[PDB]
């Protein structure tokens, strides 16, 4: 009809999705309230300016922002000094999603650089001469993979890498994030992500790891960082993902998990929150929603007959709307929410989340949902590694040609 | 000695006592990527740190240097590590170090390194006396600090300091019953002390949870807890619940309430209850009210649930294709 609003968030009924504090004010509610009111302005901006809303993904703008960042950064990116590989990844991936080609000049430099970040003992540090750490190592790999050149691949010292992973393995199945570092579910995921891609997984490498991960699932249905801790998207993702690689998804109560994640999508905002009763955030568009594809794959493997054949178990339209309308910086780059500044981390994940929301794929079945202008469509991303599915396959294949270190 | 923010602060290259050392530049290679254009101070300190690290100079001055690098980028784990090394090597006073770290945490509480450092300290000292109160203070600034909570859990656990936590939990819930972290904590405490099997406890909890729901029916946290504490044993296992929930529908409804109901029916149908069909329909009706009106954001989930329930609990589900 004519009076019909195609945008879910703008529909008059949608207003009923505003918070009901039950006249009981606590810090949690107030904060949520502030956010909702701010988001409201965003939604209503079209109405009050008297313009018909057009959802446009500022590709050009984002590309420029990325393009430059890949080369150099201001004194503001100082505290990210121990996490440079992440920058490489966040950016490269973001470009890959945007379908921007990678010049071989760039590629080679990235390689050489990452080489400089490779520790003599295996694994990668957050900068040349820094000690190796699982997070930068995960990043380094994913990055090198997005490139996929033989050069890129040959950078990685698989033997050392494996040794490294072992030096971090814990008796209770967990892993340190680095020598003398801390332990939580991230380590498991990083160790797995890289181990699988590089084909270095030995029989005992992940002994008990799955069970450790399992113990992180809590009463909320989600997953905490370590047994006993509150459920959180990042950790939840890390956990599931790790388990999916370990092919041990079954070790979890996938039901409660599902119910948990789906409840994380903010009714009014459309985007996802990291943990129950906290604020929404762009990054979670991936961290949280990325779980759906994982779950779908897992449940389906259990012959789950009730599974949809065209959508993920979250409001794809609403996520996409949130992203587009509130997480884009005019000058380029993406963000947490309105009022927050852009940064590569959010740019990377908001996009990833977006791609996910537009791309449904379960075997032969494929169905997209592209809100706004069709130029908005992105390259698909793999739900486990969060890199181009093609890159995944390309990578694994190449590495399977190699023998698991030691034989 | 000379605070990094001190007006008289001087670059290490302009420091006499450091004249014997040649700074090590960052080896970024011929044609850099993600090159940070560090400020003078920054580049200077780390250039010097790089040196001491390389030389593995385990000196007092090195110790003081680390404080600086940290102040610059407290996320630099390599620095942290080396600092621990120096603490051991230099036989530094750990309490003095505690003072230090507590200050640091206070300023950048949302960092991994800082916490892990304090953890290690406490471990070395085998002294938790300061922990709780400290953590409280941090939590008093951000009642949802994930790192702090995690630390607290670790502490209480390693030092069996359970005695006063529930009391704490209670206080926080009073301040903000919507604090999910607290709800997790409460479950953490109970699980490891009395356990939930103890019926008097179970009961007490539920009373309290319902009482909370009554006061704030829209607080998704209480609901999640409630579900959290009864689900494993089986929702059907507690018949009065259903009736009791139905009673709140009038002046205390919410998509949460409706949802819970579906979970109950779900479990009831799982444990082959009376009026198989009657329940089933009540459930599907709800899946619809949720998917179409009361909780559309989760339409895809709701459609799936109803579809699953239909898939295994319709009168036709156990009936052969030929009938």
């Amino acid at each position: 009809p004519v009076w019909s609003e195609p945008l879910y968030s703008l529909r008059p009924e949608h207003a009923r999705e505003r918070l009901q504090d039950d006249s009981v004010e606590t810090v949690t509610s107030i904060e949520q309230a502030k956010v909702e009111e701010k988001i409201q302005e965003v939604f209503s901006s079209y109405k009050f300016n008297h313009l018909v809303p057009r959802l446009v993904l500022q590709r050009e703008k984002h590309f420029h922002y990325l393009k430059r960042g890949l080369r150099q950064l201001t004194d503001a990116y100082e505290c990210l000094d121990a996490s440079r590989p992440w920058l490489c990844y966040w950016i490269l991936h973001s470009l890959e999603l945007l379908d921007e080609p990678i010049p071989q000049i760039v590629a080679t430099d990235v390689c050489q650089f990452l080489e400089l970040c490779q520790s003599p003992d295996g694994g990668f540090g957050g900068g040349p001469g820094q000690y190796p750490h699982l997070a930068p190592t995960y990043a380094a790999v994913n990055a090198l993979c997005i490139i996929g050149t033989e050069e890129a691949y040959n950078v990685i010292n698989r033997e050392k890498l494996l040794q490294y992973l072992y030096s971090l393995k814990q008796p209770d199945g967990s892993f340190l994030m680095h020598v003398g570092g801390e332990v939580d579910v991230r380590s498991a995921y990083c160790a797995a992500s890289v181990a699988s891609l590089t084909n270095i997984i030995t029989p005992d490498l992940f002994e008990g790891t799955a069970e450790w991960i399992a113990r992180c699932q809590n009463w909320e249905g989600g997953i905490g960082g370590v047994p006993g801790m509150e459920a959180h998207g990042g950790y939840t993702f890390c956990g599931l993902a790790a388990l999916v690689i370990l092919k041990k998804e079954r070790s979890l109560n996938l039901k409660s998990l599902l119910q948990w994640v789906t409840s994380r999508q903010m009714r009014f905002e459309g985007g996802f929150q990291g943990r129950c009763n906290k604020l929404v955030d762009g990054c979670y568009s991936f961290w949280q929603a990325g779980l759906l594809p994982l779950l779908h794959r897992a449940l389906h493997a259990q012959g789950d007959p009730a599974l949809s054949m065209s959508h993920w178990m979250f409001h794809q339209q609403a996520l996409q709307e949130y992203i587009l309308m509130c997480c884009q910086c005019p000058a380029g780059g993406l963000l947490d929410k309105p009022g927050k500044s852009r940064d590569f981390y959010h740019t990377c994940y908001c996009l990833s989340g977006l791609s996910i929301a537009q791309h449904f794929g379960s075997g032969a079945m494929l169905h997209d949902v592209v809100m706004g202008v069709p130029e908005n469509v992105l390259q698909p991303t793999h739900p486990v590694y969060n890199i181009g599915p093609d890159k995944v396959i390309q990578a694994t294949t190449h590495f399977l040609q190699k023998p698991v270190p030691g034989f | 000695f000379l605070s990094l923010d001190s007006p008289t602060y001087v670059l290490y290259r302009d420091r006499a006592e450091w004249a014997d050392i040649d700074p090590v530049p960052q080896n970024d290679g011929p044609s850099p990527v993600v090159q940070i254009i560090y400020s003078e101070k920054f580049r200077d300190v780390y250039d010097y740190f790089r040196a001491v690290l390389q030389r593995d100079e385990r000196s007092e001055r090195a110790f003081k240097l680390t404080r600086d690098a940290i102040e610059l980028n407290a996320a630099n784990y390599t620095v942290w590590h080396f600092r621990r090394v120096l603490l051991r090597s230099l036989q530094k006073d750990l309490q003095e170090e505690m003072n230090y770290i507590i200050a640091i945490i206070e300023e950048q509480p949302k960092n991994y390194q800082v916490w892990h450092h304090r953890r290690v300290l406490v471990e070395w000292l085998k002294d938790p006396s300061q922990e709780l109160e400290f953590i409280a203070d941090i939590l008093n600034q951000d009642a949802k600090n994930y790192h702090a909570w995690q630390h607290r859990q670790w502490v209480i656990q390693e030092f069996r300091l359970w005695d006063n936590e529930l009391q704490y939990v209670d206080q926080l819930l009073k301040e903000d019953v919507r604090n999910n972290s607290v709800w997790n904590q409460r479950h953490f405490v109970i699980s490891n002390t009395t356990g939930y099997s103890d019926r008097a406890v179970l009961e007490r909890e539920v009373q309290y949870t319902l009482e909370m729901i009554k006061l704030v029916p829209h607080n998704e946290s209480a609901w999640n807890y409630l579900k959290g504490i009864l689900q494993d044993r089986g929702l059907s296992r507690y018949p009065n619940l259903l009736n009791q929930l139905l009673d709140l529908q009038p002046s205390h409804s919410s998509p949460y309430l409706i949802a819970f109901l579906v979970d109950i029916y779900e479990d009831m149908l799982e444990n082959q209850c009376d009026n198989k069909e009657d329940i089933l329909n009540k459930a599907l009706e709800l899946c619809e009210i949720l998917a179409k009106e009361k909780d559309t954001i989760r339409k895809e989930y709701w459609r799936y649930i109803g579809r699953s329930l239909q898939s295994k609990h319709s009168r036709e589900s156990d009936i052969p294709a030929s009938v």
Binding site: Y77, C79, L80, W86, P136, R186, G234, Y345 | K110
Partner: peptide
Amino acid sequence: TKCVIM
């Protein structure tokens, strides 16, 4: 700005 994941 900082990196909240490590």
